[PDB]
């Protein structure tokens, strides 16, 4: 059964609801982005219109086989019409593809849904500054103030700095990134170039990269791996035992691993700065913990919110316990009595 939070009132759309079969009156299936909680249910036999950005379209036909003729690739900040009803698509500052999707109801409400985002004061010049919105479907992974993380710059700056400094230390250390999905491709593309290198990975992952639409790709990535000092690895695998295991593997090319493991939030960003980030250490193998996030923290979503006044929040994401969705509730009143709508 489809929950409500997943239906748009008013039409025959959902949003990111392909595990439940046939959803009674679903004209037109939505797709935010490539993420295997929101796409679930999606193969080769789906035969129903979907309705995405150019490269989840990508992605849909080449990872999980969909045929052609029922993928509806539309193009970003552009007005186009969909069953009837005016609909727009705007970058999620998510993953590769990701979107949030303004509707435009008959009767005048209009509704903005999210998807998975990172929001940004670069938002609020996009075309969500012509008009009203009334109800704004929310990604709220993190709507508690304890959640806080540096911008992706300085992360990303971190990374490099720690990348460069180690292997002019030692020419003979190998670079491993740990991923487990599309998202922040950034961690090992800037850490490749810092270095001179192209990153190397398997072939599965190497085809998900060529769906993306990054530009002089080619020049960046490959299958090749002994010809790379960065390398992709699954995120399970990034542990003392899986990369002792992989630098075997190596045939005495290298000496020392240093690793990232690009996780979302976690507790000890309430006590450490980023300058301030350790590893983990056994012998010649060392583990960096780094907070690159492609959601917002509370900061950024309270931020966002407050710019765009909605009437009414629908929440996404934590909806499952009666606390979590009380908690959500008071964050959002406190919003709305210190904006004032
Ligand atoms: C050069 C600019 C500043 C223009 C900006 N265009 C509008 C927009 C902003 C944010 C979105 O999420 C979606 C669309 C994208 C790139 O950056
Ligand atoms: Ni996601």
Redesign the pocket.
């Known amino acids: 059964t489809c929950p409500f939070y997943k239906k748009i009132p008013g039409t025959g759309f959902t949003v990111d609801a392909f595990q439940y079969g046939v959803v009674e009156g679903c004209t037109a299936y939505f797709l935010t982005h490539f993420h295997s909680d929101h796409y679930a249910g999606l193969s080769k036999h789906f035969t129903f219109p979907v309705y995405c950005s150019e490269i989840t379209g990508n992605l849909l036909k080449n990872k999980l086989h969909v045929q052609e003729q029922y993928i509806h690739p539309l193009p970003?900040?552009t007005e186009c019409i969909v069953n009837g009803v005016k609909v727009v698509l705007?970058?999620?500052?998510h993953c590769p593809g990701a979107v949030?999707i303004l509707f435009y109801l008959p009767n005048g409400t209009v509704i903005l849904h999210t998807g998975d985002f990172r929001a940004?004061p670069?938002?609020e010049?996009?075309?969500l500054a012509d008009q009203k919105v009334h109800m704004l479907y929310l990604d709220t992974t993190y709507c508690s103030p304890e959640y806080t993380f540096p911008s992706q710059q300085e992360v990303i700056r971190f990374a490099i700095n720690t990348a460069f400094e180690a292997v002019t230390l030692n020419p003979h250390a190998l670079v491993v990134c740990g991923t487990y999905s599309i998202g922040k491709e950034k961690v090992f593309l800037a850490i490749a170039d810092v270095l001179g290198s192209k990153v190397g990975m398997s072939q599965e992952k190497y085809k998900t990269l060529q769906c993306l639409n990054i530009p002089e790709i080619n020049s960046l990535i490959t299958t090749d791996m002994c010809s790379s000092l960065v390398h992709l690895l699954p995120m399970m695998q990034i542990n003392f035992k899986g990369l002792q295991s992989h630098l075997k593997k190596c045939g005495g090319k290298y000496n020392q691993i240093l690793a990232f493991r690009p996780t979302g939030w976690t507790h000890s960003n309430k006590f450490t700065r980023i300058a301030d980030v350790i590893p983990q250490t056994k012998g010649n193998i060392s583990i960096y913990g780094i907070p690159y996030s492609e959601h917002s923290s509370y900061l950024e979503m309270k931020r966002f919110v407050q710019w765009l006044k909605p009437q009414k929040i629908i929440p996404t994401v934590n909806v499952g316990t009666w606390k979590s969705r009380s908690t959500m509730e008071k964050y959002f009143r406190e919003w709305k009595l210190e904006a004032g709508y």
Request: hydrophobic share 45%; net charge negative; no cysteine.
């Open positions: 970003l900040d705007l970058d999620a500052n949030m940004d670069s938002m010049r996009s075309l």
